[PDB]
Amino acid sequence: SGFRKMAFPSGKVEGCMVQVTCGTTTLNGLWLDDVVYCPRHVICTSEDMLNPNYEDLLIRKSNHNFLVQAGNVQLRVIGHSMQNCVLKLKVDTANPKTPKYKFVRIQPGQTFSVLACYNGSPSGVYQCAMRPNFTIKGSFLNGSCGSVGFNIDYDCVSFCYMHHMELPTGVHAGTDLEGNFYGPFVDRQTAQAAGTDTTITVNVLAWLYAAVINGDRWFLNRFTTTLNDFNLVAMKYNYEPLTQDHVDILGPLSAQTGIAVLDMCASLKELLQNGMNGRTILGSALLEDEFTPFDVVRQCSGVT
Amino acid sequence: SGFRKMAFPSGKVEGCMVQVTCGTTTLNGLWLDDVVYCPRHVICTSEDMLNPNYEDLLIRKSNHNFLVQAGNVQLRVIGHSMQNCVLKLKVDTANPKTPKYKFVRIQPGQTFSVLACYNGSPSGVYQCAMRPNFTIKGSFLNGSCGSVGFNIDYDCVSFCYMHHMELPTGVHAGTDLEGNFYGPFVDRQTAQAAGTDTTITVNVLAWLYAAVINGDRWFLNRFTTTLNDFNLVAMKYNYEPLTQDHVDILGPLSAQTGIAVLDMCASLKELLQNGMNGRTILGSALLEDEFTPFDVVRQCSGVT
Numbered sequence: 001s002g003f004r005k006m007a008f009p010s011g012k013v014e015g016c017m018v019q020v021t022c023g024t025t026t027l028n029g030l031w032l033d034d035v036v037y038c039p040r041h042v043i044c045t046s047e048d049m050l051n052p053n054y055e056d057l058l059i060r061k062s063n064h065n066f067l068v069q070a071g072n073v074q075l076r077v078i079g080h081s082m083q084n085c086v087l088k089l090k091v092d093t094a095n096p097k098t099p100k101y102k103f104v105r106i107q108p109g110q111t112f113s114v115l116a117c118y119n120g121s122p123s124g125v126y127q128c129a130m131r132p133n134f135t136i137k138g139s140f141l142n143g144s145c146g147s148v149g150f151n152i153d154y155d156c157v158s159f160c161y162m163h164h165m166e167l168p169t170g171v172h173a174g175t176d177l178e179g180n181f182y183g184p185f186v187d188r189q190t191a192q193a194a195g196t197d198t199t200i201t202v203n204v205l206a207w208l209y210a211a212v213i214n215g216d217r218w219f220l221n222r223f224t225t226t227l228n229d230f231n232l233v234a235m236k237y238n239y240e241p242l243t244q245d246h247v248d249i250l251g252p253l254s255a256q257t258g259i260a261v262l263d264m265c266a267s268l269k270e271l272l273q274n275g276m277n278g279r280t281i282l283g284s285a286l287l288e289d290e291f292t293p294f295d296v297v298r299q300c301s302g303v304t
Numbered sequence: 305s306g307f308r309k310m311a312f313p314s315g316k317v318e319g320c321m322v323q324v325t326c327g328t329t330t331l332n333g334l335w336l337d338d339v340v341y342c343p344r345h346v347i348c349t350s351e352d353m354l355n356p357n358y359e360d361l362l363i364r365k366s367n368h369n370f371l372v373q374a375g376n377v378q379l380r381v382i383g384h385s386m387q388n389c390v391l392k393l394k395v396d397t398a399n400p401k402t403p404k405y406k407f408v409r410i411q412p413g414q415t416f417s418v419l420a421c422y423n424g425s426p427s428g429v430y431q432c433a434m435r436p437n438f439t440i441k442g443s444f445l446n447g448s449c450g451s452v453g454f455n456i457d458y459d460c461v462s463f464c465y466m467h468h469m470e471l472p473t474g475v476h477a478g479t480d481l482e483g484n485f486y487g488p489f490v491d492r493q494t495a496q497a498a499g500t501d502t503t504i505t506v507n508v509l510a511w512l513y514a515a516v517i518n519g520d521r522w523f524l525n526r527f528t529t530t531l532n533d534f535n536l537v538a539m540k541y542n543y544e545p546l547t548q549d550h551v552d553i554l555g556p557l558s559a560q561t562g563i564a565v566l567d568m569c570a571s572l573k574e575l576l577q578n579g580m581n582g583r584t585i586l587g588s589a590l591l592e593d594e595f596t597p598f599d600v601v602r603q604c605s606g607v608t
């Protein structure tokens with residue numbers, strides 16, 4: 001029993017973190033096989049960051065200008081290229097700790113673990129969601145750039161996020177491991193405003209199911225609703241619209257609890273309209289939206 | 305910027321988890337040097353658990369009855385002893401992944417990371433606090449017993465917790481790595497009620513400082529208070545009394561923010577008396593008490 005915001009065990013990713021230095025900029029890189037992946041703004045001065053021409057800046061850089069340190073041992077850079085917003089540094093040594101891995105581009109609402117790192121050294125691990133406005137709400141200080149987000153399936157790490165920047169509002173933006181930003185963000189120190197941070201409805205419902213499984217049931221009511229009726233309420237409260245795809249994904253939690261998805265929607269609708277009246281659900285005073293249905297199944301079933 | 309409930313990177317502990325089986329009971333063990341540590345109730349049938357005589361049950365067990373598997377390789381048990389509520393299985397092989405480590409018995413209010421494990425396999429990592437009633441609010445299913453709680457100081461893992469049981473109220477109880485329960489709990493399937501789960505005041509204040517550092521400042525008010533006056537309010541709200549030791553520990557956060565500790569106490573007092581009025585602090589609708597002052601400094605400064 002009990003339900004916690006849980007990160008994947010980070011060991012497989014810890015074994016992949018290195019320090020990258022170019023001139024006087026140090027950040028984190030990800031060493032997989034004989035490639036180190038890092039944010040391309042490693043090549044920028046904070047002056048460069050105001051309006052960088054990355055192709056022009058990169059002309060001035062040779063392999064030997066990229067200092068890559070794995071623990072306290074230097075890696076030899078034998079090649080470098082830019083792919084979108086990441087640099088790929090080819091090194092002469094395959095990372096011996098390379099896990100089975102994939103690169104995935106996640107959808108908004110998907111959760112992942114972040115291994116926050118500084119100078120190639122892991123500091124902590126926490127669980128994030130890709131927000132519907134393609135930001136994440138992380139914990140990143142200066143030097144954390146190149147820290148990565150990941151999911152683990154048994155022994156395979158799916159890397160989905162590399163940290164690139166903080167918006168002036170203190171939310172975070174980054175790329176997949178092909179260097180494509182999530183959302184409309186660019187790796188430039190300029191005005192970039194996030195859109196509406198809507199609530200991930202299907203995740204809230206998953207978490208309500210998790211609550212029922214764990215004995216928090218006070219919010220269950222006598223009502224049901226329809227997708228269309230629920231969606232009018234969702235719109236009013238800046239919740240994402242619920243689709244039949246979302247209902248389908250919640251089917252196993254519906255089956256396990258015997259609470260129809262549309263009944264749980266009606267419970268959520270009343271919570272939106274009435275608030276929590278100073279009560280809590282799984283130790284939260286607000287409706288948690290950073291657990292996916294898959295997360296809830298995993299934690300509630302004990303997958304390793 | 306940003307402030308997250310952050311666990312220590314778990315790799316060093318992942319390398320220590322093994323499966324222990326005795327008869328038909330399987331749970332987790334901790335392999336450090338040539339000793340595997342696990343809950344002594346590994347020797348019990350669920351029938352035994354109602355009123356176990358562990359010394360009498362252990363007489364019937366030989367080294368070869370303890371099956372210890374590290375990944376998919378069996379360890380040879382060459383000795384076994386009971387220390388309090390843990391078994392120590394001497395194996396013929398030192399764990400090659402043994403980190404620098406210590407065993408510490410933590411105080412109520414102290415935070416630590418849990419590596420939830422099943423069959424010796426890590427499933428997830430999350431951040432816990434030892435509650436003032438010596439319970440923790442974890443996420444533990446059947447098979448998670450022997451999962452451990454830890455802090456990391458640079459390269460040294462301080463193990464503080466091993467998971468033993470769930471109370472009928474679905475909160476968790478366990479031992480230090482000398483096998484002494486936190487609190488009055490016993491490893492028996494009997495009525496065991498937790499005492500008052502009071503709020504860890506010094507942790508709430510730390511988290512309020514974290515909020516100010518991260519730009520959440522709406523709750524700062526024009527007032528101050530005294531320890532005695534604050535403590536009358538704390539008592540009323542089932543908060544732990546604040547001592548000058550707690551004020552001393554908050555000194556660096558006071559210094560960094562320029563907010564006197566007693567001023568932040570007066571802010572907390574108003575939040576207790578007035579509630580949040582539907583507002584949030586660091587994305588929470590309730591006052592978070594599972595960050596220590598040391599945690600807040602660490603996360604806000606970026607220690608690795």
Ligand SMILES: Cc1nnc(CN2CCC=C(F)C2)s1
Pocket residue numbers: 025041042044045046049164165166186187188189190
């Ligand atoms: C060199 C650097 N100087 N500042 C940095 C942080 N941010 C600034 C905004 C945009 C990013 F992509 C990187 S990197």
Ligand SMILES: Cc1nnc(CN2CCC=C(F)C2)s1
Pocket residue numbers: 329345346348349350353468469470490491492493494
């Ligand atoms: C064999 C076991 N059968 N049930 C177990 C879980 N709990 C029950 C309560 C008290 C504990 F120490 C262990 S262990």
